[PDB]
């Protein structure tokens, strides 16, 4: 249906015609356009990392943290090393909250 | 009859008109590779059409 054909025309203009590098005039600050896109990707990565972490911040990390804590917790079930014990501590915290 | 003869040629191969009839003989040679290149490349290009 038309709704799909419209999105095709719109995405074409975005891919070719709409460039933020030109509309913001970043040529004043950046050396080459080929390098600008590299920074845009690293930004996309950092954005995605924070977004995925923000989707559900209250969780015990599966990865081994190197002696560091997220926030003023340091002793909550989020900070427990062994996951078997952490599950029991989280269940108690969850039924309360 | 002469007109009908040439019409068949120009309908299939209109590019023959770029070489005048009186100049046709000055291009011939005993070997095909010996033909004068004055029109060789031009005919090949016109044969591809208007685009």
């Amino acid at each position: 249906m038309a709704v799909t054909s419209f999105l095709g025309k719109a995405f074409e203009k975005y891919f070719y015609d709409f460039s933020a590098y030109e509309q913001f005039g970043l040529n004043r600050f950046l050396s080459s356009k080929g390098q600008y896109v590299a920074l845009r990707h690293v930004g996309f990565v950092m954005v995605g990392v924070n977004v995925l972490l923000a989707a559900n911040f209250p969780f015990n990390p599966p990865f081994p943290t190197i002696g560091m804590c997220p926030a003023g917790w340091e002793g909550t079930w989020v900070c427990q090393a062994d996951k078997a014990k952490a599950l029991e501590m989280y269940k108690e915290w969850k039924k309360s909250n | 009859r002469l007109l009908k003869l040439w019409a068949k040629r120009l309908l299939v191969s209109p590019e023959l008109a770029i070489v005048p009839l009186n100049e046709f003989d000055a291009q011939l040679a005993s070997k095909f590779e010996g033909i004068s290149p004055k029109y060789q490349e031009l005919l090949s290009a016109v044969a591809q059409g208007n685009k």
Partner: protein
């Protein structure tokens, strides 16, 4: 970590099936098309010298 799979024969049969399908598809679908296009140009380029000469001997138009 995961070192050994659940079945080695299952993994090997999967790879062989895929490779066999690609081989069949290549000989039956890809190569006939490729050769039809490739050999058309190659034959003309290789014969153009002898083809035009043979034709030049046959037509009495000159």
């Amino acid at each position: 970590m995961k070192l050994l799979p659940e079945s080695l024969q299952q993994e090997a049969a999967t790879a062989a099936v895929v490779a066999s399908w690609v081989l069949w598809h290549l000989d039956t679908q890809l190569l006939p098309t490729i050769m039809r296009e490739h050999k058309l140009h190659a034959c003309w380029a290789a014969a153009a010298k002898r083809y035009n000469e043979k034709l030049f001997k046959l037509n009495p138009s000159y």
